[PDB]
């Protein structure tokens, strides 16, 4: 499970930034979660005080968005949800999540 | 195996027409050896006029596009050559088969010397740049820069001096300057875990690494084994055979002031995983141990896990 | 000894459009040319898990995981207008004829001994009972599957195109005819000899059906419901979708071709429990469960391997049946 | 014996979508033709007001939360200023024939349940069904929050089977108690309507036209459509008041809750305010789940034992039985 959301970071990454220009524009729904993490840098034509809007757009909302979709796609025992298994899964797909917040909530920093 | 003070850089090193046959019974990538071999190379270019030495290497091949092709619709790969000139005679030559391929792949280098407050970072990441540009890498030449302007830096850092969060700052601006590659470190670990766990038939490690690279089918207890990383077979150094000639005894040698030794090379195991799944980037080095009696000459991944 | 063709199949007779709905006021439907329609449009809903949940995991925390955030998604309604009572459902049904002669086959002795047993159903009785059967499941509200039930006065006009005009208006009203049972009149005899003389192949017939229900004042219809594949997608998407025209509610035409067809009365563990879908195995799929049990010998199947192989004749209700699922149309044969 | 794979029943009480209108005074006398309320957007500066974590060591979020405040779009359905009354209109139609199932499989499941909600409806009248579904009317706990703090709230039931009015129904909702279950005439005589429409012996269609007095041009909340991804937070991320043609709207299948309250025998305190039915009743307004089925008051329990098991429960149970057999919704397995 980490190794394939830590695979899937790395190759969004790569993938991602083929372009050099993007920004807010229609169709940008994903730019709400992908603006920073899956994206590349912007253009710099803009006003220097825009710092803010990529500096500080965390892995919180693309990153929760990952994993509420990995949760939401994939699931756990559901006759056996007190055992240990889905616990141990629940726990790796929130370290899963967390360590992608961490590695793509500085896309503008 | 000295711990380096600097973690250099050379962030896209474009080669064409490398050597991809590498061994006798690998054919992907161009061997780490050589890779430690440019190291030496190049500390043996710039680390006489610097007071420094070069040990460390990092890999992280960004794309990989080969030279193959494949023969009528077979699911072999035969590779494809380069023409020869003609004899005496002028029929055609004895052409034999040589593989190619099409890489890049950054350098993290590791300074381990004295010379780095004598001289500040641009500088001698400038110059190693500018002597790393003109060699030759692994059969193959290293491609220029154009007009495309943006990698054309070549950091550096300083691993004496700082804080644990300053050097995961260091640590989130370098692997951040290599996003999209593939980091390259040999397993033991694994590699022992599997003679171990195979270990009631036979210890043959050949067996075992035929049978570690594979889509494996099994029975009921369609199925096919699974892994957590990408796995390769590289080769991992020399496995010298012949008692140490003198210089002067063998004919035909290279030079007549050094020794030579005959040698199969060695087999091990590596692996594929991204720079961010390891912490600190002094795990990612290919130092070489070597020793004299004992004809055993090894590139090894140490300090890793 | 002769026996069944491989590959028959049998065009569909009775052939319905799509009903299309709209809606305006009553004591103004005699004006029903300008009506708006009634446009499908979207609404949101907070549930709560309310199916029969297994009880060997009962547990407060998931159960509370549950009820605090609970699942939301986007259901599409129909609705009338805000001045609008009444729900104008217009289709039209066109009645082709020449119901035995199939339109594949894969021998010809087992063709011509079906059209000869078709033909000596026609010349020994006519189809005048299965006439007026169709003219009750348009004379009610039988075509409105749910819109019947909780309205007022269901006023059905069926009009008859020939040429670019009407011949003969009808003017029913599907409460004063019963919903069950099977009555005729001398309007009712004269849809019915409309629709025997199309089916017995003796003249063109294109009946457009033009219904009137009173539902209420905005009160919510129900057209039909499309399918949408959700195997637990990200962002909670749609779970019901309607229907739809170019910008208007509608009704499937195999809907309407099931509600017409609704003739059955003879299945052989009750009558009183209603008319059902005239189909071979005769299976209403509300219930989940298949009258004409291929354990007795009233199935469609047997009927007519016998009656035609054979020569046996079944009862002249079940030669009723036969033929009302030869004229539904499907494939047959092995 | 046992149940079938799929029951499912209809929406009786099915009612329809509201039209908040508005208008001046001595009008509602004979309001015809008031303009409506609609929806209407403005801006908003959000600054933020919510919890922050304790030992606040980093400035970083003294100056980020507010030198980069945020700015949004909240619609707000005000009345204009010279009108008083939210005329909440809408219609509700009663089908009856309750027991009658919509979708049932097994025959003999299918008996037993048609006997035994017919010895209900023919041994104890569904008079206490309608006597509370006509407190529900009475009061405007349809209105799920615009009841709080008014001078009036007037009803007007009315009842319609052909195309004319019949009499005047004229109440308040502060003389009417909210939680009274208790027994009026004028009450009792709608409740007789409705006890008629209920049962099967004929039809009835009731609209309700709750003149809710909230104030000259005070702030209503009609529902929240919801929204997902595709959309920035300019663009009317926050809320989307729910809507029909040019006017504001109230849902059918929130009022549709909002009226079916038999269940005051939830087990912790009725004194605590009534409940909205549902098998497994629970309230995610409060978010607890009463009536557990580790408890006997789950209705799959009450049904499963009133219809297999042939034990029958309380007759407070049965009412309740009954008040989620009229809802409708999916059961079985």
Known sequence: VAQICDEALQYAARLRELEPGWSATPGCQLHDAEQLWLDPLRAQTDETFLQRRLRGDWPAEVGNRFANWLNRAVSSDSQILGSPEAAQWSQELSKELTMFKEILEDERD | VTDPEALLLLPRLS?????????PLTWGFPSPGAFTGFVHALQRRVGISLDIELDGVGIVCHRFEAQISQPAGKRTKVFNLTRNPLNRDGSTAAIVEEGRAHLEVSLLLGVHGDGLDDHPAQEIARQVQEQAGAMRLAGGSILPWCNERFPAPNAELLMLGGSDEQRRKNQRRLTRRLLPGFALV?????????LETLRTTLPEATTLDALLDLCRINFEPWQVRDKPGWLVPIPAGY???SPLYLPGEVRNARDRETPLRFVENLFGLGE?????????????????????????????TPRFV | ILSTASVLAFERKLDPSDALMSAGAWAQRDASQEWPAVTVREKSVRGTISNRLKTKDRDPAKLDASIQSPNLQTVDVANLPSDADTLKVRFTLRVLGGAGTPSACNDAAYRDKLLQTVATYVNDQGFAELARRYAHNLANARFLWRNRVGAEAVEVRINHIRQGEVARAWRFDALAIGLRDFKADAELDALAELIASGLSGS?????????????????????????????????????????????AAAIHSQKIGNALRTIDTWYPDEDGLGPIAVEPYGSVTSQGKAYRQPKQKLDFYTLLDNWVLRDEAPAVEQQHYVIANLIRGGVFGE
Do not use: C, M
Request: cysteine-free; proline content about 3%.
């Open chain 2, 186 to 194: 040999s397993r033991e670990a694994l590699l022992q875990q599997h």
């Open chain 2, 15 to 23: 080669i064409q027409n490398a050597n991809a046959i590498s061994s």
């Open chain 2, 272 to 300: 594929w995983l991204s720079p961010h799944r390891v912490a600190a980037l002094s795990d990612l080095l290919w130092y070489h141990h070597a020793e004299p009696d004992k004809g055993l000459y090894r590139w090894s």
């Open chain 2, 239 to 241: 496995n010298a055979l």
């Open chain 3, 203 to 247: 003249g063109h017939v294109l009946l457009e059906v033009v219904a009137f229900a009173r539902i209420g004042d905005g009160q919510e219809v129900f057209p039909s419901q499309e399918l949408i594949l959700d195997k637990g997608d990200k962002k909670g998407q749609k779970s019901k979708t309607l229907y739809s025209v170019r910008d």
